[PDB]
Structure formats: C-alpha cells, structure tokens
Design a protein around this ligand. Structure first.
Ligand SMILES: CO[C@@H]1[C@@H](n2cc(-c3ccc(Cl)c(F)c3F)nn2)[C@@H](O)[C@@H](CO)O[C@@H]1Cc1cn([C@H]2COC[C@H]2F)nn1
Length: 138
C-alpha cells in the first residue's frame, strides 16, 4: 500500500494492449477520485468519479490541453461505493481508453491526445487507500 497522491511512471508512454490495474479501497465519506494520464502538463485522460455533484454521483472524463479543460464526457453509471475495495482497469486500445471497474465494463474514452508514447505518467489521487498500481501487456 501507498499514500496518495501517487504517480505511476509509464516509461515511453502507453501502447495498445497495455492493461493498467489500480487496486484500492474508497475512503468512508469519499467525495472524489481522480486518475490523470499525463503528457507533460497536458492531461490526456482524466477519470474523475464524483460522489456528490449536485447530490448526484457521476463519472466525469476530460482532457486538459495548454492548462485548459475541454469537453466533459459524463457517465451516471457509478460502480464505486464509500468504504469498499475496488479495481479500476484501464485497457489502452488503438483509438480509446477502455475502463472496467470490478470486472464490469464502464466506459470508453476516445484518444484526443494522439501521442500515446508520450503519455508517460499516471497520477492517482483523491479519497482512496491505494493498495497497488501496476500494468501488464495482454
Ligand atoms: C474543479 O476542478 C475540476 C477538475 N479537477 C479535479 C481535480 C482534482 C484534484 C484533486 C483530487 Cl484529489 C481530485 F480527485 C480531483 F478530481 N483537479 N481538477 C476536473 O475534474 C475537470 C474535469 O472537466 O472539472 C473541473 C474543472 C473544470 C471543469 N470545467 C468545465 C467548464 O468548461 C469545460 C468543462 F471542463 N472547467 N474547468
């Protein structure tokens, strides 16, 4: 186990068939979780479960370019629960990131940042206890 925030290096960036597995437990009374796939200062893929946006649970996904957030993609399907162990898997595919939580498909996010081999860090932050962050090739 690791104390967030934590940065997982992704040397030489990501590539299709790379499967990133984040294991942890959501804190009690959690407000937010964030994964940030970074290309330098740019965020290629921000994955942001929000436990209380306007008293609703929602997943917000976005990209940050030149320090500006772009168009949000939102999902109401919300597989996280305060206090519970989770597994987030991000599968890098040729045209999107595919996310599954607890072995159930959640969403796809099309690549806005095209230079996958420069997406060289994954930030993990928010209201979690982080057990593990690793990857393999499928
Ligand atoms: C409040 O900031 C968030 C921003 N955010 C979260 C964290 C964050 C830090 C720490 C932790 Cl521990 C953690 F979980 C975290 F989510 N940092 N930045 C990120 O979620 C963003 C996603 O779109 O929305 C907000 C910023 C934003 C949204 N928009 C819209 C208007 O124009 C287009 C749209 F994009 N403009 N700016």
């Amino acid at each position: 186990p690791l104390i967030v925030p934590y940065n997982l290096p992704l040397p030489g960036g990501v590539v299709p068939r790379m499967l990133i597995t984040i294991l942890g437990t959501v804190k009690p009374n959690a407000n937010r979780i964030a994964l940030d796939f970074q290309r330098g200062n740019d965020v290629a893929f921000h994955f942001n479960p929000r436990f209380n946006e306007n008293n609703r649970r929602v997943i917000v996904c976005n990209t940050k370019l030149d320090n500006n957030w772009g168009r949000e993609e939102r999902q109401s399907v919300f597989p996280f629960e305060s206090g519970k162990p989770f597994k987030i898997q991000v599968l890098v595919e040729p045209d999107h990131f595919k996310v599954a939580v607890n072995d159930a498909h959640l969403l796809q996010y099309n690549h806005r940042v095209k230079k996958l081999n420069e997406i060289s860090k994954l930030g993990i932050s928010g209201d979690i206890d982080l057990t593990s962050a690793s990857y393999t090739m499928i």
